[PDB]
Amino acid sequence: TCPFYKKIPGTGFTVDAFQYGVVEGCTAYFLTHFHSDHYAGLSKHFTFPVYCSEITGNLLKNKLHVQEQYIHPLPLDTECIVNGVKVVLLDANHCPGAVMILFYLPNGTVILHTGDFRADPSMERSLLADQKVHMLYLDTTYCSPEYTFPSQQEVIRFAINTAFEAVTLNPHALVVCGTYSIGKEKVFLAIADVLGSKVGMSQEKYKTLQCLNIPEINSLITTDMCSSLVHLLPMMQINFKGLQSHLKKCGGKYNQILAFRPTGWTHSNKFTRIADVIPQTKGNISIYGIPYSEHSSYLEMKRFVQWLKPQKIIPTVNVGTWKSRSTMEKYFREWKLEAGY
Numbered sequence: 542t543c544p545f546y547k548k549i550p551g552t553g554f555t556v557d558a559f560q561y562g563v564v565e566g567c568t569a570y571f572l573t574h575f576h577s578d579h580y581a582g583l584s585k586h587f588t589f590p591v592y593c594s595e596i597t598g599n600l601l602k603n604k605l606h607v608q609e610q611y612i613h614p615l616p617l618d619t620e621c622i623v624n625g626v627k628v629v630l631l632d633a634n635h636c637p638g639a640v641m642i643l644f645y646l647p648n649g650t651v652i653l654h655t656g657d658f659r660a661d662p663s664m665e666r667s668l669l670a671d672q673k674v675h676m677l678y679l680d681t682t683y684c685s686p687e688y689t690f691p692s693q694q695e696v697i698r699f700a701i702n703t704a705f706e707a708v709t710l711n712p713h714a715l716v717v718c719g720t721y722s723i724g725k726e727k728v729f730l731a732i733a734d735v736l737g738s739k740v741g742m743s744q745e746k747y748k749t750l751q752c753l754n755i756p757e758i759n760s761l762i763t764t765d766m767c768s769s770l771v772h773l774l775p776m777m778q779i780n781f782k783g784l785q786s787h788l789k790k791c792g793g794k795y796n797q798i799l800a801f802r803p804t805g806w807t808h809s810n811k812f813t814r815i816a817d818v819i820p821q822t823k824g825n826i827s828i829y830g831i832p833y834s835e836h837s838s839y840l841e842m843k844r845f846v847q848w849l850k851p852q853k854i855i856p857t858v859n860v861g862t863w864k865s866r867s868t869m870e871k872y873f874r875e876w877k878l879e880a881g882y
């Protein structure tokens with residue numbers, strides 16, 4: 542059964558609700574982004590209207606084989622009418638194609654659903670500036686003050702400088718980056734750019750990247766592993782055993798591996814700064830865990846909500862325990878009392 546926090550009141554709409562069969566009363570299914578916990582249930586046999594971004598629609602058609610007649614892509618930053626209700630899609634600063642959805646209810650209520658997002662001050666100058674928002678369905682992934690991490694720009698500077706130093710010292714070193722979903726493409730693209738290389742990957746991963754409308758992509762990625770010194774592998778293979786095995790396959794072209802695992806937050810953020818990050822090393826293999834987040838930090842989330850001043854907040858993450866729900870509710874009240882709304 543579909544949970545209450547995936548239903549939009551006063552409409553026939555659900556959000557990220559594809560794993561519950563036919564939802565009673567649902568005339569249109571919205572999909573915020575192409576991550577598996579959100580699309581779970583979609584396939585070539587789905588026959589209801591799906592509303593999403595252009596990029597998300599490309600992935601639905603090519604990766605899940607959803608029939609074109611049921612895919613309804615909408616442009617961003619543009620007022621659209623869906624089943625008699627005005628809606629707007631806004632960039633979520635998450636992965637490629639990810640959106641927030643603004644719903645203008647017939648009765649005058651305005652609802653913002655953030656999907657998954659990384660809050661940024663630039664959102665304060667979008668179409669959100671124009672009107673009041675009554676209810677906020679919020680990505681609360683990191684809603685506690687221990688969740689600190691650096692800017693994406695600082696993390697990429699560290700990665701570029703690290704990779705460039707290592708390969709300039711040893712021209713026979715290979716760089717490897719882990720992936721298991723779309724998102725965080727800047728990590729591998731920025732490293733390849735500084736090294737003058739294309740990024741090598743499987744046919745399946747190449748297909749996925751070709752769906753993302755990234756400018757000049759044909760100049761940056763390849764399926765020819767032998768021509769490339771930046772390789773993408775499944776996140777599960779980024780360990781000493783898996784990387785040793787990969788180095789064997791490269792046929793003595795390389796004699797060292799520098800590997801990156803772009804996690805979200807890990808507890809080592811509480812002690813260390815990005816500049817002081819060090820790898821785990823065994824022989825000629827080194828692995829860096831880098832805190833590249835596509836979700837709001839606690840402080841970023843707090844700033845966004847105190848700017849927006851919603852009348853009611855509905856969390857969409859960490860909803861399953863009473864301890865998590867109580868913790869989040871206490872922070873929402875603090876934020877309201879500090880700001881005066």
Ligand SMILES: c1ccc2c(CN3CCCCCC3)c[nH]c2c1
Pocket residue numbers: 618631632633663664665666667668
């Ligand atoms: C999500 C986040 C930010 C924005 C903006 C604000 N823009 C300011 C102008 C300079 C750079 C572009 C960004 C418009 N729509 C958005 C959706």
Ligand code: NI
Pocket residue numbers: 574576635657
């Ligand atoms: Ni996501």
